[PDB]
């Protein structure tokens, strides 16, 4: 019966742990102990963007490194030009409880979702000057927590019914589902090649997923509490995570182990977002105590601090030319650092 | 400013005007969150408040003395709620409904009250408490078959308050029962408070016609007490 099944499972877990333990000859810090530091790094705020009425809950930058989108619970989406602080679009929603947004890589569409369990897709470039809903995807059984386009035809979602799905916009129907997680799925990150992706859940676990097969390829388990954020290192061979135990960590895909830990004893608040830099050297993170931190990714050092918000920091991101960082908080303000 | 500069400026200024009209309607309306279990009668309060007029959430609108209230009810979620609850950190009030004649599930309702009261993003929000189904409680107490102190051992040592109000000529036994169950929730709300939020209890049943007036009065008190704090230095 199930007693034997569980005993076999425990044996296989012992085998996996020993297979990983045989591979641990060196530590990253021993390899990098002969390296110069980066010194102190100091950033300043160039623009402050004003206009929302309630807490800002998500944002996303554009491939065109100039334009931006952001979402707020008063029920609005705004599209900004960040060189001039000069609003381009403002869009009113049907439900006020939104939690995610995303640009398409071509600048033709934006998307959003939230507490009603639907994904809605907006078309900006119509012959009409107006902006109207094109699609409403309607099959999930819990709220929508993240979202990322892949092209103008296909989109990937994660929800609070503990599944992720891949969707076909022109037809409207799901094409594949990913089911193995146990708690809510909180984030999601696409690969540079768009053939793999990773996710982390309200369960101290991350999984690597194959888009085209619809299967799980690997599982990574190092944290203590719910994982709130996740992202890929630039060459496609690594990823970093941050959770409610107030730690960030770096995992490697080929070695199949945890590789570096970034923490401190004075930090006892959870982490809301993480983000990498363009050469991979700086890892930037956001926290519940109103500030953001800058770590050297190779040394577990603490090379900088960004301050200036009054309420919880909820979102953060870096552009494709690597020039500037954008942050958003429960203040209802957005800020650009460089 | 050339062509593109001026056109982009004129466009962002029209957007500014429309956002100005939106701000006013947003600020003249009050949001409420409705909570309770399924053996509680929450929907009947929802229906009595309709004469004032496969989804994940439901809304009902009502108006009293020319003021507007929006009440929000959650349906079609899983039973784990430590994440979506955070969306509600800035409602005017929470409304908690309880089936008061069900002795066998009251400790679970008390645990719900404690978790809501002590959360980090919900610690400046006030609660209006409805103690529903009073005719059933009356019938049970008079019938004499079941006992409170089988579930709550300290009822043997309870005496009615002095400022109780048994006006309609009801039995003293029903009055002890009513006030004991009320004092249980008021003990939790006074233990860990800090002065930034309060609780407002009411006794009710299924044929009451006057719950919108009670909600009106309690929100008036809440908003006045908030005014006193934000504007000590005006």
């Amino acid at each position: 019966e199930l007693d034997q099944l569980r005993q076999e499972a425990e044996q296989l877990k012992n085998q996996i742990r020993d297979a990983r333990k045989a591979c641990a000859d060196a530590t990253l810090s021993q390899i990098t102990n002969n390296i110069d530091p980066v010194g102190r790094i100091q950033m300043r705020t160039r623009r402050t963007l004003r206009g929302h009425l309630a807490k800002i809950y998500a944002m996303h930058w554009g491939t065109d490194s100039r334009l931006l989108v952001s979402a707020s619970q008063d029920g609005k989406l705004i599209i900004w030009d960040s060189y001039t602080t000069n609003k381009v679009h403002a869009i009113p929603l049907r439900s006020s409880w939104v939690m995610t947004c995303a640009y398409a890589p071509s600048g033709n569409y934006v998307a959003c979702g939230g507490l009603d369990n639907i994904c809605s897709i907006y078309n900006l470039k119509t012959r009409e000057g107006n902006v109207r809903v094109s699609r409403e995807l309607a099959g999930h059984t819990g709220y929508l927590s993240c979202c990322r386009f892949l092209d103008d035809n296909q989109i990937v979602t994660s929800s609070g019914d503990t599944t992720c799905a891949l969707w076909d916009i022109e037809t409207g129907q799901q094409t594949t589902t990913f089911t193995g997680h146990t708690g809510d799925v909180m984030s999601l990150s696409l690969a540079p090649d768009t053939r793999l992706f990773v996710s982390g859940a309200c369960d101290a676990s991350a999984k690597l997923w194959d888009v085209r097969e619809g299967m799980c390829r690997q599982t990574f388990t190092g944290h203590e509490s719910d994982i709130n954020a996740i992202c890929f290192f630039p060459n496609g061979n690594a990823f970093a995570t941050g959770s409610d135990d107030a730690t960030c960590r770096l995992f490697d895909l080929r070695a199949d182990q945890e590789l570096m830990t970034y923490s401190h004893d004075n930090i006892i608040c959870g982490i809301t977002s993480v983000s990498f830099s363009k050469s991979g050297r700086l890892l930037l993170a956001g926290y519940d105590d109103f500030n953001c931190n800058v770590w050297d990714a190779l040394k577990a050092d603490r090379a900088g601090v960004l301050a200036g918000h009054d309420n919880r920091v909820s979102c953060l991101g870096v552009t494709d030319d690597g020039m500037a960082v954008a942050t958003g908080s429960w203040d209802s303000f957005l800020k650009i650092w460089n | 400013l050339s062509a593109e500069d001026k056109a982009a400026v004129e466009r962002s200024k029209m957007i500014e005007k429309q956002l100005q009209k939106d701000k006013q309607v947003y600020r003249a309306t009050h949001r409420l969150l409705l909570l309770g279990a399924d053996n509680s009668g929450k929907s009947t309060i929802v229906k009595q408040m309709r004469i004032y007029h496969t989804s994940g959430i439901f809304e009902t609108k009502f108006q009293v003395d020319k003021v507007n209230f929006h009440m929000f009810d959650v349906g079609a979620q899983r039973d784990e709620r430590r994440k979506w609850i955070q969306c509600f950190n800035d409602v005017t009030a929470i409304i908690f409904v309880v089936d008061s004649s069900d002795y066998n599930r009251l400790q679970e309702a008390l645990n719900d009250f404690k978790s809501i009261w002590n959360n980090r993003w919900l610690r400046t929000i006030s609660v209006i408490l409805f103690l529903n189904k009073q005719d059933l409680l009356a019938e049970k107490v008079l019938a004499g078959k079941s006992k409170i102190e089988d579930y709550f051992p300290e009822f043997a040592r309870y005496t009615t308050p002095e400022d109780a109000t048994p006006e309609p000529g009801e039995d003293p036994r029903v009055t002890r029962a009513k006030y004991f169950i009320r004092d249980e929730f008021l003990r939790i709300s006074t233990a860990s408070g800090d002065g930034r939020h309060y609780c407002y209890p009411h006794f009710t049943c299924s044929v009451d016609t006057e719950n919108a007036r009670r909600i009106f009065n309690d929100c008036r008190d809440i908003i006045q007490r908030m005014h006193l704090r934000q504007y000590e230095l005006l």
Partner: nanobody
Amino acid sequence: QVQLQESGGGLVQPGGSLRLSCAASGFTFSNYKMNWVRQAPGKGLEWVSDISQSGASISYTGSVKGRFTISRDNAKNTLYLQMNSLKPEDTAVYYCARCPAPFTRDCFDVTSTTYAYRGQGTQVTVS
């Protein structure tokens, strides 16, 4: 990997006594608040008892308030419950539960149907 393994159950005649223990692994034991829950035949999950980070504040449900006792040991990573006078109504499965986050006062979702930081359970039969 977070693990909680709980043991001590079995068959008792009414009026007897019993002791249960949990061994924890995979988290820093002392930042967390700990709980005991149980499930009887034909019902749902029900909250039994409660202890906080240091052991100073304790809490019990109404029907076991004079009979059961809860304690913890942070140097051995262990949790304990002791049960003194058992009744036929105590026949159930017992589970050991953890609070979701550290340094926190509220305790959400610990009796839900699926929950990630709960163990496998132990059977207790009184007759």
